[PDB]
Amino acid sequence: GLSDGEWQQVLNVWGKVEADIAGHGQEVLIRLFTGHPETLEKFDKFKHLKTEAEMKASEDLKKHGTVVLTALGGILKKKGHHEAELKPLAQSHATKHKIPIKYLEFISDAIIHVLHSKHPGDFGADAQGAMTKALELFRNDIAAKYKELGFQ
Ligand code: HEM
């Protein structure tokens, strides 16, 4: 897992996200949808968005971005002791939303990209390393739940 120092880095970086959750959430989803169009198809409520301009102007997309990052933030603050918070998320995304683990890899990468884009020069090598480890832990624990369900 992560060391105490690494978790402190993760939560310090997260402070940046919390200053503008909607903005970060919106950019993460737009990065995901524009870089991997197949992901948009998983959202019946966002498949009407044919352009990035429409995505940017969508208040409902910003709303979902807030829901997504608020959930992730709650998980991150548990510093790995997130079974109760993560299990239900893993099961809903596998059985209900049908989200391949590959898409979770895509959104993890999108988060790192957005952090650099919104905070250039202020997301250090150590910070990136820590956030990456936290996102991999998140993804890997979801993957374990996916295997349990036999979900691909
Ligand atoms: C940072 C990783 C993610 C987090 C924390 C997250 C969190 C959530 C939460 C809290 C909800 C609402 C509750 C629920 O249905 O469980 C939700 C809904 C949903 N998520 Fe995710 N999600 C993540 C990644 C993804 C990815 C990668 C996809 C597909 C590309 C996806 C697709 C969906 C869909 C389709 C819904 C239902 C939306 C609706 O129509 O209301 N999620 N997600």
Swiss-Prot record:
Binding site for O2: H64
Modified residues (Phosphoserine): S3
An annotated GO BP: removal of superoxide radicals
EC number: 1.7.-.-, 1.11.1.-
Positions that bind heme b: H93
CDD domains per the UniProt record, alphabetical: Mb
Compartments (UniProt record): Cytoplasm, Sarcoplasm
Positions contributing to nitrite binding: H64
Catalytic activity: Fe(III)-heme b-[protein] + nitric oxide + H2O = Fe(II)-heme b-[protein] + nitrite + 2 H(+); H2O2 + AH2 = A + 2 H2O
Principal location listed in the UniProt entry: cytoplasm
Any one GO MF annotation of this record: nitrite reductase activity
Gene3D superfamilies (alphabetical): 6.10.140.2100, 6.10.140.2110
Cellular component, GO annotation: sarcoplasm
Keywords: Cytoplasm, Heme, Iron, Metal-binding, Muscle protein, Oxidoreductase, Oxygen transport, Phosphoprotein, Transport
Quaternary state and interactors: Monomeric.
Family listed: Belongs to the globin family.
Name this protein carries in UniProt: Myoglobin
Organism field: Equus caballus (Horse)
